[PDB]
Swiss-Prot record:
Subunit structure: Interacts with host PHB and PHB2.
Naturally occurring in which organism (per UniProt): Avian infectious bronchitis virus (strain M41)
Residues of the full protein shown: 13 to 371 of 3953
The name this protein goes by in its record: Non-structural protein 2
Function text: May play a role in the modulation of host cell survival signaling pathway by interacting with host PHB and PHB2. Indeed, these two proteins play a role in maintaining the functional integrity of the mitochondria and protecting cells from various stresses.
């Protein structure tokens, strides 16, 4: 017969934040934090009793609207203060710092630059866990400021994923991340939209809290994790630069020492060892789809037609040097085909071949 704290479903974001910030939960990363705060906000709206593990022990809460009169309960209303809260829950050291951050917003939220400086410096007052909760706060003005820190982390993981080999490319930098995050995080611009842009951005920072995976699709690099988020537009602008890139051997896109086929990126290497001088080949980089094959030996009795097949790569074949490149070549019924090859990996950009005609 414990006390069930009745908490008004309409409580303001800041109050909601202070209540939630009693949580004992130790958040794994932004994904976990986001998951935990989302469950809790949902629980509150169901208006069903449910549990709340705090740093003052376990309480039970229940979201309400109009309170049925009588059975004197303890109630957190829309107009309650930190004080009313502390009367019920005790003191949360975190909540108190949060009351403090709010108090100083009148300074740090003045402009982009104040917002950035409060963000960058934030760990001077909060530890990693409390930071992550700030980054999922309901109060827009706090979450938007705190999230600023995540751009740096995410930007970084992006380069790392792209490896050294692709650093030159990163120089999609400014027109990138920078502006996209900027637009997405902007606090003064098209407001009233802000509540929604901020909620999309939490979702998106959750989506990629955990890892960043670069793949190749349709001859573009794409960051899987931005794919169904408001951060897609970075995948889009990258696609657009790939789009405009020059077409090359077997229908790939050329940039630098690299080639970008349907579903994989390879570096082109001049004079691949162990073939004639001037023979070129391919070396897969990063994540590739293709077919593990067997190369029985070299044959030179084929010509590459300018023309695609859209058929299964056979798992045993030969190498053949076509258009100056070491390719994989296979037979399929009476017909021949060629494909890009790296080591014993065949990519699926299948082109038709003809056996040579004699005089």
């Amino acid at each position: 017969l414990r006390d069930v704290i009745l908490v008004s479903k309409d409580i303001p974001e800041q109050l909601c934040d202070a209540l939630f910030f009693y949580t004992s939960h130790n958040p794994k990363d932004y994904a976990d934090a986001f998951a935990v705060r989302q469950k809790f906000d949902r629980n509150l709206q169901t208006g069903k009793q449910f549990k709340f593990e705090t740093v003052c022990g376990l309480f039970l809460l229940k979201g309400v609207d109009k309170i049925t009169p009588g059975v004197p309960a303890k109630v957190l209303k829309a107009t309650s203060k930190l004080a009313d809260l502390e009367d019920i829950f005790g003191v949360s050291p975190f909540a108190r710092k949060y009351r403090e951050l709010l108090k100083t917003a009148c300074q740090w939220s003045l402009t982009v630059e104040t917002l950035d400086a409060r963000a960058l410096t934030l760990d001077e007052i909060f530890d990693p866990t409390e930071i992550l909760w700030l980054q999922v706060a309901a109060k827009i003005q706090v979450s938007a400021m705190a999230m600023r820190r995540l751009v740096g982390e995410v930007t970084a993981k992006v380069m790392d994923a792209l490896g050294s080999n692709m650093s030159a490319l990163f120089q999609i930098f400014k027109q990138q991340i920078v502006r996209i995050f900027q637009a997405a995080l902007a606090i003064f611009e098209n407001v009233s939209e802000l509540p929604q842009r901020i909620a999309a951005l939490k979702m998106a920072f959750a989506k990629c809290a955990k890892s960043i995976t670069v793949v190749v699709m349709e001859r573009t690099l794409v960051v899987r994790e931005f794919a169904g988020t408001c951060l897609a537009s970075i995948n889009g602008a990258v696609a657009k630069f790939f789009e405009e890139l020059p077409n090359g051997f077997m229908g790939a896109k050329i940039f630098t020492t690299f080639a970008f086929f349907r579903e994989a990126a390879v570096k082109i290497v001049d004079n691949i060892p162990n073939a004639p001088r001037g023979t070129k080949g391919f070396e897969v980089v990063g994540n590739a789809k293709g077919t593990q094959v067997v190369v029985r030996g070299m044959r030179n009795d084929l010509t590459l037609l300018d023309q695609k097949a859209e058929i299964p790569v056979e798992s045993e074949g030969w190498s053949a040097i076509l258009g100056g490149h070491l390719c994989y070549v296979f037979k399929s019924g009476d017909r021949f085909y060629a494909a890009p090859l790296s080591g014993n990996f065949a990519l699926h950009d299948v082109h038709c071949c003809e056996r040579v005609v004699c005089l």
